[PDB]
Symmetry: D2
Subunit: 344 residues, 4 copies
Amino acid sequence: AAVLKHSSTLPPESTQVRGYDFNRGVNYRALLEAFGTTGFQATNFGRAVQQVNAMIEKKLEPLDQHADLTQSRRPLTSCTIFLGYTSNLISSGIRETIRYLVQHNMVDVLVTTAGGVEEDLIKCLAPTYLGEFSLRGKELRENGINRIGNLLVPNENYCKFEDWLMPILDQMVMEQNTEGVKWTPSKMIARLGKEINNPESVYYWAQKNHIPVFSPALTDGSLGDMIFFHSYKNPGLVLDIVEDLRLINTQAIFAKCTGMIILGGGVVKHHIANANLMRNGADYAVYINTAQEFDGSDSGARPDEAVSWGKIRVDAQPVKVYADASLVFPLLVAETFAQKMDAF
Amino acid sequence: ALAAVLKHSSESTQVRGYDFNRGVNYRALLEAFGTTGFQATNFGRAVQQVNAMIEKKLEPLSQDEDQHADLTQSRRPLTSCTIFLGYTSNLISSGIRETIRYLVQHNMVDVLVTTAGGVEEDLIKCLAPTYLGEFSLRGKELRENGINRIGNLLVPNENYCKFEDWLMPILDQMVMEQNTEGVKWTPSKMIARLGKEINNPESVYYWAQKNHIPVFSPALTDGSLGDMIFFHSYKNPGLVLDIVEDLRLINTQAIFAKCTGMIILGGGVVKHHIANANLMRNGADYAVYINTAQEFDGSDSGARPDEAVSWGKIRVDAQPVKVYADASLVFPLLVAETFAQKMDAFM
Amino acid sequence: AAVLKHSSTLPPESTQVRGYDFNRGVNYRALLEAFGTTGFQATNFGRAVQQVNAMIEKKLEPLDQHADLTQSRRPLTSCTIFLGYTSNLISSGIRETIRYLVQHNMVDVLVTTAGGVEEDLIKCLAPTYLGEFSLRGKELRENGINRIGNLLVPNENYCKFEDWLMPILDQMVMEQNTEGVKWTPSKMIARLGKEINNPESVYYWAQKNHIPVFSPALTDGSLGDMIFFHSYKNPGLVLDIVEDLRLINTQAIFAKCTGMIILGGGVVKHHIANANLMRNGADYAVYINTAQEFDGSDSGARPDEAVSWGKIRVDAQPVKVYADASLVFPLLVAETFAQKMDAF
Amino acid sequence: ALAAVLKHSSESTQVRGYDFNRGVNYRALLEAFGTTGFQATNFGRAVQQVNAMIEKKLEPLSQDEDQHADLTQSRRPLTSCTIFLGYTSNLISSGIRETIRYLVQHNMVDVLVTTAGGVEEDLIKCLAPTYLGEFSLRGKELRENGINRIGNLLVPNENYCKFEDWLMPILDQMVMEQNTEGVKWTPSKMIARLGKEINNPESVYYWAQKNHIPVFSPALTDGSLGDMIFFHSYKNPGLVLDIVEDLRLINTQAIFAKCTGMIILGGGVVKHHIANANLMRNGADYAVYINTAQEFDGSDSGARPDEAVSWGKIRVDAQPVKVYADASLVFPLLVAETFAQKMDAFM
Ligand SMILES: O=C(Nc1cccc2[nH]ccc12)c1cc2ccc(Br)cc2s1
Ligand SMILES: O=C(Nc1cccc2[nH]ccc12)c1cc2ccc(Br)cc2s1
Ligand SMILES: O=C(Nc1cccc2[nH]ccc12)c1cc2ccc(Br)cc2s1
Ligand SMILES: O=C(Nc1cccc2[nH]ccc12)c1cc2ccc(Br)cc2s1
């Protein structure tokens, strides 16, 4: 008191901390709304809801398409939304959440990691089960079960996938060799989505709605195993990543405005957003992941790192929620996209 | 081909997330966490464990249980499950203070344990508010403006000055009562007195004292309360706070519990062997931890519940759960699906 | 290039990234020196070495003692160093590192958490063993073994401690009741250190060198179990925390200069450093821990949080190394205290 | 009293740290990590596993092993243990680039796998340096100054411009060779060509191509290399990079290895079943991960090695180790105690 500085009155729009009062009973909407003033990551959740709603409102504003350069059947809107997620999230029930968004045309580009395609298709053939993180590899191997976090996928699921996939790969090679088709990951993912023909599949809806999927490390997962084994029976498949780079970059540079929602990981480090002459950098970004920055990893980098790359604009107000997206993403969707369903 | 190199597989639950084509049915959405995987599934497991704990607590005491239950000397009648609620001080600076207060107000837990700061921040909030900031705010600028940072929260210096003004006359009475009325102070007794003084239904500690829920915090002096006790001791020396009597009081609760449950937020459990001395039921039958700490450095805060099983603090036959998440997100959701659904049974 | 800003030439004291070159062979001192320019937490390690060396050099500068108010047998020096650590570190081999520092009078005040006293004393009676994090509580219980991270402590170790401790507790109660002794945690820890009479013990050396130990939550660990069981045989022990608060605070407010080294956890949140009229706040601080800030925990708070409390000075350059102190602390000591041994 | 309530206990190593009363004997200090506990003990275990891997690699191939070893079509003669070294791109921006380069220079590993950025940052460092900064540096100010942030490292925009100037004529030759000499490019072949072009002994990829160590990075286009390939394709269209042939090349290495070891820095392993198709020895016999990622979100990067055992990628009988630490601290120490001690055996 004799030793502490007098406090400079805080701004008049300064928000007081207050949690939800259960003496009101349980109104879940009011409970989720109270996260904003609860503090720590609950506050970041509230900030994320605000950012995603701003992104959606921008997208819904009514509108040159550059269709010659984009080579795309999907018309530009007032905000191009990129949805990114790691493959573990597709093994989880967040697959249902992502599918919903894609089914209703709520996002414009999907980006994922190795495994992130096939686990969606495999779930159309056979289920993934709940287990525990602590289950020992020895016991699981003796029982022909693969672990993904606390999830369990029987070996047979991958055997069923192989059987389903092989005649599709045969057609792809035949179409390449005799019909001039130049395959890329995104074109392959669209074909698999068409083939699975199942409304529970993310990739079925993506292709139906002309939402492209980019995954240049497609071969790092089970799909790689299959392509490789297939090549011994029917050699010659080629997958080019350069044309996919051109397709996604033309989306990036001709977007009127850009928003990103990134789950489980971080963003790529590159300068292409600076070549968007209309609006360089994203106006909106939300990350939801548990990774930490201190090892220098891409996954753990804060959004403000991407501002130095030009990937997110200096004047954007990006938000990271430090949490497992399996918990947070359905809540975020409940308060954003699922409210605006009528507009989509 | 894979069938040639992979082994065939030999009450199992399928993974499935909430389908928003059903609309936003919030209870169904929360219920779908259990089958969503990763920490969402641990949330579902926690809901189940807390509800089991609640159902146990609400069971009538049989005649024999009632006898051995009644072997504490305390005010608070014993129930079929003694619930310990533990939390780090940062959560009292957060809005989770309201959630904790609700539980205490309705006698839904039996013992509170917290860390340095965890008492005074509740009391100070009855005198002046805490505000939202950001984690990245620089110490230099905050210092210039007379503002203290707690995570992404902000507490003005003036809050601690108002607290000092409020507290000094109470410390004066406590010393006078110690020296003329034979009062032997301990942290728990001080915490009860401060709750009674604040006399405000938004205060966790007001309700704890009103409902005879003891609060234990032997490192009481490591926070702002320490600062004030210290300065007070200049003009009014000799206040004694005995931690041994508080140890006796908490261990007596632990030892004579018919059954024990723990809900621990923000940190981990203490390492000791006292639960092995409960004659009726050694170790906790239920336990939920909610925190983001990791085990790999050997820290208490990051230890899995199964560590405490080796100490006897949690029973081998219990099914404890840790949700690896910030309790500011998870705890209100947990309460919504557990205690808040059974509020009438506690009224 | 057409889209990227020209780079503003960096400061002339800007340091280039370069790792150790093993084509030189293996000089471990040069290897540790190269951490500074390696990046990420290796760079923070280098910064920590610099900060600890600055703290030591300050302490070693030749010098009013305020002995009336401090009530202390230890003379003030040009820098009071506080060493803080969580109890798990005393179960680890970092016990040997801490003991070395205390034995050679290299620090002035020890602060620890529940368990942090007794595990040092118990190791003088019986050993702790290596195990694994994944060992199941059921199996350990069946074999009478307690787990601490990947360390294992037999139940018998605690039984031996009980037998050793009981007659000391008897003496403490007798001294309280008939010789006017007013016990506090710090006085108790000094007595136990004297009693263990073993040069492997941290607390033996602390008492021998008049380095006080503060642990107001002393009763949260095994020592609490013992005090409690003892009270059934010999009631009446009182441990006051207020007098310990006065002792440590008088150290804090009369220090000429303050440095802190904090292992495994964060600092306490209070304003007492502002009452040091000579030099308010610490001039030097190093934290070594793996905790993350995003939940708002004290353990995970960056040093810059404590600057807002006045606990660390605005003009200090504190460092956090995001790492397990079991790896980093011996390396830090090798490059700092262990180099200046001749000066102590 | 405790003896009354606690059970008695039934090649075990005692905990003991390095004693600095012995002076600063650095090798003895490093050796004491094994008995220090927590991650220090995991470091000791990693040293042991990497040394076992090295001793295996240096074993002569028997006559039978030599036959089945020789079933790849590759330049690089097969050895008794094929070591895969994996690392995230951030580590190439760090000083660990020098450590990796040393291993590659001396043929101490057999296959390199990295992420987007992990190729170009090595090449760019031969044209211009990376500098130390801080994690907290604000994007706004860095943008104003034309500086890119990678953790606490700083790379000026001008570095990427110099890289573009250097790279464009090489991309011109690659397209010309593709269209007139029948070259079928893949990421690994491009990486080999870029190493040969840079022609600088500080470059990881210079040494990899010189020593016939293939590099695999199917997401090559997710970094700055992508930016440049993209712009190049305006005036010189049609470059194809086939990821299927690279898949074939890496799987052939994996399938015909006599024995496999992995050292993975910064991230986790891929999830697939290809190791189950190695006829001689399915799964890795040795594996060390060094990263700070946590498993609880189900992420690849945070998975324990024992997850990969369920996929067949690591053998049930292996004793894999994860050190939970920033590889910038740990990897040079690991190399000091393993590969660097056996350098003569690799020369
Ligand atoms: O931003 C990305 N990709 C690109 C956007 C725009 C133009 C691009 N060109 C080349 C790449 C690329 C990202 C891809 C992924 C993948 C998984 C996860 Br989780 C996050 C992200 S963020
Ligand atoms: O279990 C605890 N205390 C005790 C229970 C029962 C008998 C006892 N005797 C001595 C101590 C003690 C715990 C105390 C705290 C404090 C903050 C947080 Br977060 C978690 C915990 S768990
Ligand atoms: O700063 C501390 N204590 C105090 C210094 C000076 C005056 C004080 N008054 C009341 C408390 C106190 C700290 C105590 C501890 C304990 C374990 C670990 Br890890 C870190 C720390 S930091
Ligand atoms: O194991 C990997 N790749 C493969 C080995 C063998 C046969 C394969 N086939 C298809 C992929 C592949 C890994 C790749 C990477 C990349 C960065 C980091 Br950090 C760790 C790893 S581990």
